Each structure stands twice: as C-alpha cells, then as structure tokens.
C-alpha cells in the first residue's frame, strides 16, 4: 500500500451535546484542492459509514440521515484541510473519523466509498451519556 | 519507458496549458478514475527544435514522484472531471519495443492554446 497523505485529528472524550471540531490534513505534497472531499466514520464493531462530502469548490455539501442537521463540512484549499463542526453529539456518533480525498471536480451525487481515495488515518471521537 | 501517447508540438510562442477538466489525452482502455496526470516539455536542440510536450499518467514517468499540483519548471497538470488523487501505477509507462504509442486524441471543444494543433 502506501504512506498516509491525509490525517485526522481533534478527535477526544466528550459528553452528551457536546461540540467538537475535526481536520483532515493533506500532507507530504498532497492537495485537496479543485478535489471534492469525504468524511466517514467507523463505530466500534460496525461498517464505515459515509458522514459527510463537500464538492470540489465548496458551494454543496451532503450528509448522511443521522448526521443531518448537527455536523457541517468545510474546506479550506490554502491549508489544505477538510473539517468536520460536530454538534449535539449523541453516544451513537461514538466512532473512528477520517476523510477521503474524493473525485476531481465532483460532488454531492457521488457520496459512494468507491468515490473517494486515498483514504486518512483516523482520530477517536468517544461520547458519554 | 516513455509516453503512452504521441507528443503536442508547441509550434508558437505560448507554453502547453489546458483549463480544469481538459487536456487528458483519450484512452478507452482506462477508467474515470484514471483520467489525471501531467506533460512534460521535452524540447530538442545545431538549431532548437519546437517542443514536445508527452503525457504522462500521474504517479508515472520521469515525474512519477510529483504530487498533483507540484510546480516544477516544464510540468502541466490536468485532470478530466471524476479522476481521482492516486498514483496510475497499473497503467504505467509504454515499453517503446513491446507496445507503441497511442496518436494522442483530445475531445471536441477542447481549449488549446496558440500553436497547438489536435488533428
């Protein structure tokens, strides 16, 4: 395989509705930019799971049924960073977060796995009741 | 090791450019995922020719080590709307005794600058 070129972090032990605040970081050359982009999420035990995508320029953004209404994705193509604002955290949103660079010039109709690559290692996100 | 395709000459004054989503030589024999990489003016020189400028698949070629969007002198970037930011390294480099060069076909519409030339 390969080295990592997208790293998450921010992740923590938090409570109940509480907020916490995701990055993805594109390193070792990497770019994010005129790319769209992919948070996804791993919960103990379970299957990845698509979260969030925000297209290429940043004007679109979709998420799952769960996460809606409570995480916004955001970019910030100097930096090279994707973010994930999460809100009114639930137990359930208990997981394993990392993003994935997504598809040139894409958006919002692909929110598929097979639409993203490379994948980042990820950062624990653990929430009490 | 060597181009898939068939070079672009630069028969003016202006350097090799395309728009976002433009310049990706058409390969049947590769997917939307691959549709990414970069050209490399090769230029040759006792007068000096007009350069060439060779496509490349990116994660291959002389610049296989460039990440998408690295700024080095001679080195384009392009991309058809779907690629994806990984190396190409199933498709690879052309072996000049085994296989031969494809004769480099851009789609309809594509926006070329002046004194380049596609059939």
């Known amino acids: 395989m390969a080295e990592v070129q997208l790293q998450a972090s921010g992740g923590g032990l938090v409570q109940a509705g509480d907020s916490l605040r995701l990055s993805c970081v594109a390193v070792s050359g990497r770019t994010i930019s005129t790319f769209a982009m992919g948070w996804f999420r791993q919960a103990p ?11 290429w320029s940043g004007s679109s ?34 997981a394993v977060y990392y993003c994935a660079s997504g598809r040139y010039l894409g958006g919002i ?21 | ?17 395309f728009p976002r989503g433009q310049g990706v030589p058409i390969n049947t024999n590769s997917s939307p995922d691959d549709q990414i990489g970069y050209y490399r003016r090769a230029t040759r020189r006792m007068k000096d020719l007009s350069p060439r400028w ?31 930011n990984t190396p190409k390294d199933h498709i690879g480099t052309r072996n000049p005794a085994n296989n031969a060069a494809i004769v480099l076909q851009l789609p309809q519409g594509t926006t070329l600058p002046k004194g380049f030339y596609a059939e």
């Open chain 1, 45 to 55: 035990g379970k299957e990845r799971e698509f979260v969030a995508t925000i297209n």
């Open chain 1, 61 to 94: 953004a979709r998420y799952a049924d769960p996460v809606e209404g409570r995480f916004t994705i955001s970019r910030d193509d100097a930096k090279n960073t994707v973010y994930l604002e999460m809100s009114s955290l639930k137990p359930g949103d208990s």
């Open chain 1, 109 to 129: 109709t692909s929110y598929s796995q097979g639409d993203f690559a490379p994948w980042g290692q990820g950062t624990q996100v653990t929430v009490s009741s």
């Open chain 2, 1 to 17: 090791t060597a181009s898939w395709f068939t070079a672009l000459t630069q028969h003016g004054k202006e350097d090799l450019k």
């Open chain 2, 54 to 84: 060779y496509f490349y698949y990116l994660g291959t070629g002389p610049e296989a080590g460039l990440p998408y969007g690295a700024n080095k002198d001679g080195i384009i970037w392009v991309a058809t709307e779907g690629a994806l």
